[PDB]
Write an enzyme that holds these catalytic residues in place. Structure first.
Site, PDB file in Angstrom:
ATOM      1  N   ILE A  14      49.542  95.583  38.375  1.00 36.53           N
ATOM      2  CA  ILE A  14      50.225  95.376  37.086  1.00 36.53           C
ATOM      3  C   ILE A  14      49.166  95.159  36.013  1.00 36.53           C
ATOM      4  CG2 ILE A  14      51.777  93.923  35.643  1.00 36.53           C
ATOM      5  CD1 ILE A  14      53.364  93.374  38.253  1.00 36.53           C
ATOM      6  N   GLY A  15      48.317  94.136  36.191  1.00 36.29           N
ATOM      7  CA  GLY A  15      47.261  93.818  35.234  1.00 36.29           C
ATOM      8  C   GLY A  15      46.234  92.842  35.803  1.00 36.29           C
ATOM      9  N   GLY A  20      41.667  86.545  37.635  1.00 36.40           N
ATOM     10  CA  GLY A  20      42.937  86.745  38.316  1.00 36.40           C
ATOM     11  C   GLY A  20      43.467  88.167  38.176  1.00 36.40           C
ATOM     12  N   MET A  21      44.444  88.497  39.010  1.00 38.08           N
ATOM     13  CA  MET A  21      45.083  89.814  39.035  1.00 38.08           C
ATOM     14  C   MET A  21      46.530  89.643  39.415  1.00 38.08           C
ATOM     15  SD  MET A  21      44.248  93.077  41.505  1.00 38.08           S
ATOM     16  CE  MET A  21      42.623  93.301  40.830  1.00 38.08           C
ATOM     17  N   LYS A  37      50.474  86.560  41.185  1.00 38.40           N
ATOM     18  CA  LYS A  37      49.201  86.428  40.476  1.00 38.40           C
ATOM     19  C   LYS A  37      48.150  85.770  41.379  1.00 38.40           C
ATOM     20  CE  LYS A  37      47.720  84.021  36.189  1.00 38.40           C
ATOM     21  NZ  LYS A  37      48.414  83.265  35.125  1.00 38.40           N
ATOM     22  N   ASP A 132      48.382  80.845  23.368  1.00 38.12           N
ATOM     23  CA  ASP A 132      47.946  82.233  23.501  1.00 38.12           C
ATOM     24  C   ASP A 132      49.140  83.156  23.475  1.00 38.12           C
ATOM     25  OD1 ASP A 132      45.932  84.185  23.588  1.00 38.12           O
ATOM     26  OD2 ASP A 132      45.826  84.158  25.776  1.00 38.12           O
TER      27      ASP A 132
END
Ligand SMILES: Cc1cc(-c2n[nH]c3cc(NC(=O)NCc4ccccc4)ncc23)ccn1
EC number: 2.7.11.24
Length: 340
Positions: A14-15, A20-21, A37, A132
């Protein structure tokens, strides 16, 4: 390595971030796809602090417009724990991706803004700052439900210690930074999030970021280029000698009318935009006022805009704890999810 077996299989990217991923996965217990995550923070004190704050915050919160934590996967001992995996609801897209492909109607903008502010009312009622907010942290589904995610830069509000010097370095995403970040603020008051929401509303109105600064001081150049020169009263509130001197040194700049930037936008949306993008954070609209604004009148219902039952009443005091103590705290905070 993405070690989430055996409950979670058929992984897909996904991203990713600096440590992290996030992937989608199939949950073999509930028979539904989920987001996972992977976080690998243990080599750095700062990453441990952020990870611990996100987990503590998200585990305390329960709100329809805030991503939850459904499960946390990690090794059974501190010695064997090298990564931590957070399982969350899988959404269909995010506002960043949506804005690349389509122009939103006013009624979609209005409903998304309502949900962002509903979720933010809850966060702020818990004495928490997200810090954020941006399109990629607003997750969406086809039913137009919106959830706020990514609390890695969140903090407990600390308005008494918000002051800092002129041009102090800042962690959060540049384009969504309030002007005071560059002038005198550490981003420890609720008004920091309202500015980011204002930027997001502008971006929904035109599919382009409103203040796309190319570097740190250019961000303030873009903000002043639209808001124009601050008033004498706002300068009198600026705190820092260097910030005052800088603003007094600039040639006079007139304000760019919101209706010239956004000639097809709803006049009530632009009135609310003006109030969220107010230069002086003390004069900037608060979340509860924003929900009560005429633009959102069709959705406004304080009885269906819940607040937190257990706010964070104190600072977490993680700043001077070594990464080894923070690993122990992350291990203890994630223990409830272990088998048995
Ligand atoms: C198809 C799809 C799904 C999602 C999505 N669903 N659920 C999610 C949960 C999260 N959570 C999350 O904390 N994302 C931020 C992050 C991710 C990786 C490294 C550092 C920060 N992120 C995205 C998602 C987002 C975009 N497209």
């Amino acid at each position: 390595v993405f070690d989430v077996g055996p409950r979670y299989t058929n992984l897909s990217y996904i991203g990713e971030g600096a440590y992290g991923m996030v992937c989608s996965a199939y949950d073999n217990l509930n028979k539904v796809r989920v987001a996972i995550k992977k976080i690998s923070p243990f080599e750095h004190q700062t990453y441990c602090q952020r990870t611990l704050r996100e987990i503590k915050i998200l585990l305390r919160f329960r709100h329809e417009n805030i991503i939850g934590i459904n499960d946390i996967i990690r090794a059974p001992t501190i010695e064997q724990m090298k990564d931590v995996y957070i399982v969350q609801d899988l959404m269909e897209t995010d506002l960043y991706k949506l804005l690349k492909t389509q122009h939103l109607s006013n009624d979609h903008i209005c409903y998304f803004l309502y949900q962002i502010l509903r979720g933010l009312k809850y966060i702020h009622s818990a004495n928490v700052l997200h810090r954020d907010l941006k399109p990629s942290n607003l997750l969406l589904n086809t039913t137009c439900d919106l959830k706020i995610c990514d609390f890695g830069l969140a903090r407990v509000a600390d308005p008494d210690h918000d002051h800092t010097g002129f041009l102090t370095e800042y962690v959060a995403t540049r384009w969504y930074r309030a002007p005071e970040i560059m002038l005198n603020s550490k981003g420890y008051t609720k008004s920091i999030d309202i500015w980011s929401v204002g930027c997001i509303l502008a971006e929904m109105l035109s599919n382009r970021p409103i203040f796309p600064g190319k570097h740190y001081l250019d961000q303030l150049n873009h903000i002043l280029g639209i808001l124009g020169s601050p008033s004498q009263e706002d300068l009198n509130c600026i705190i820092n000698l260097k910030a005052r001197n800088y603003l007094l040194s600039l040639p006079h700049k007139n304000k760019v009318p919101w209706n010239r930037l956004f000639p097809n936008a709803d006049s009530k949306a632009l009135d609310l935009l003006d109030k969220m993008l107010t230069f002086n954070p003390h004069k900037r609209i608060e979340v509860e006022q924003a929900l009560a604004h005429p633009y959102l009148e069709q959705y406004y219902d304080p009885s269906d805009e819940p607040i937190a039952e257990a706010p964070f009443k104190f600072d977490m005091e993680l700043d001077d704890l070594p990464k080894e103590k923070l690993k122990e705290l992350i291990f203890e905070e994630t223990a409830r999810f272990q088998p048995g």
